Design a binder for this molecule. Structure first.
Ligand SMILES: Nc1nc2c(ncn2[C@@H]2O[C@H](COP(=O)(O)OP(=O)(O)O)[C@@H](O)[C@H]2O)c(=O)[nH]1
Ligand SMILES: [Mg+2]
Lengths: 165, 76
């Protein structure tokens, strides 16, 4: 079966690991454990194809940059995640997308913009702001809650679908 | 101040080590999210001082006495 190598990047604390765990184990991780690096492997079925998701969960910006710098030329697909209640993490997206465009070689790399924590009521990034960003990158935007699971499969399966294109 | 543990199946975790903790304590959360079982596995310390060779751990062995090296975990 086909393997899909997905990488999850974004500011510290936005929910990269909780989205991943929630995808992996169906469990919401309510504790905050900052990541240095974690990779998971999971057998799933997406649109009728049994496949392997290899997911590289990366370090927020706590800190830990000097780690994923080819581990990025290995990724086939990137989830760039910010939290809807953390303006600064939305503003950080650009740096990640530039890191990604650098470490591969194209401005069409399979990618999805995920605004996480959409269960919170303290929104400071509007849907519209994120849609504009994603439109300018040429990629989809999807809102997610690792807590409630809204959008979490959509987000990963969409990234898979971008990769199959 | 940490631990770089290779898991079963091609899975990496790195672990921040605080104190009191065995390898069971610092790792049991790592395995159980990955659907895996602590007393189903063995953990070992890696020395390529012989070229790629493994040093065995008790699960109640310290965290601290590792705080700069490399481990990998394998079904017992
Ligand atoms: N309410 C809410 N909290 C979340 C969500 N995702 C993550 N969190 C919490 O935010 C903190 C950061 O989560 P984590 O996945 O470690 O962030 P990461 O550093 O980007 O991997 C943890 O307490 C998570 O429980 C979400 O969708 N909704
Ligand atoms: Mg994390």
């Amino acid at each position: 079966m086909t393997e899909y190598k997905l990488v999850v990047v974004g500011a510290g604390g936005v929910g990269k690991s909780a989205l991943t765990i929630q995808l992996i184990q169906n469990h919401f991780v309510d504790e905050y454990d900052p990541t240095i690096e974690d990779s998971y492997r999971k057998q799933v079925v997406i649109d009728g194809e049994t496949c392997l998701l290899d997911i590289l969960d990366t370090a927020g910006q706590e800190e830990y940059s000097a780690m994923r710098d080819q581990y990025m030329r290995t990724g086939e697909g990137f989830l760039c995640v910010f939290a809807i209640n953390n303006t600064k993490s939305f503003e950080d997206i650009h740096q990640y997308r530039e890191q990604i465009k650098r470490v591969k070689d194209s401005d069409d790399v399979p990618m999805v913009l995920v605004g996480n924590k959409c269960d919170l009521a303290a929104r400071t990034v509007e849907s519209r702001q994120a849609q504009d960003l994603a439109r300018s990158y040429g990629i989809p935007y999807i809102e997610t809650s690792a807590k409630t699971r809204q959008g979490v499969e959509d987000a990963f399966y969409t990234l898979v679908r971008e990769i199959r294109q | 101040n940490t631990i770089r543990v290779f898991l079963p199946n091609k899975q990496r975790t790195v672990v921040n080590v605080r104190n009191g903790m065995s390898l069971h304590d610092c790792l049991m959360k790592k395995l159980k999210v990955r659907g895996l079982q602590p007393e189903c596995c063995a953990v070992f310390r890696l020395l390529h001082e012989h070229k790629g060779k493994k040093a065995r751990l008790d699960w109640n062995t310290d965290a601290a006495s590792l705080i700069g090296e490399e481990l990998q975990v394998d079904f017992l």
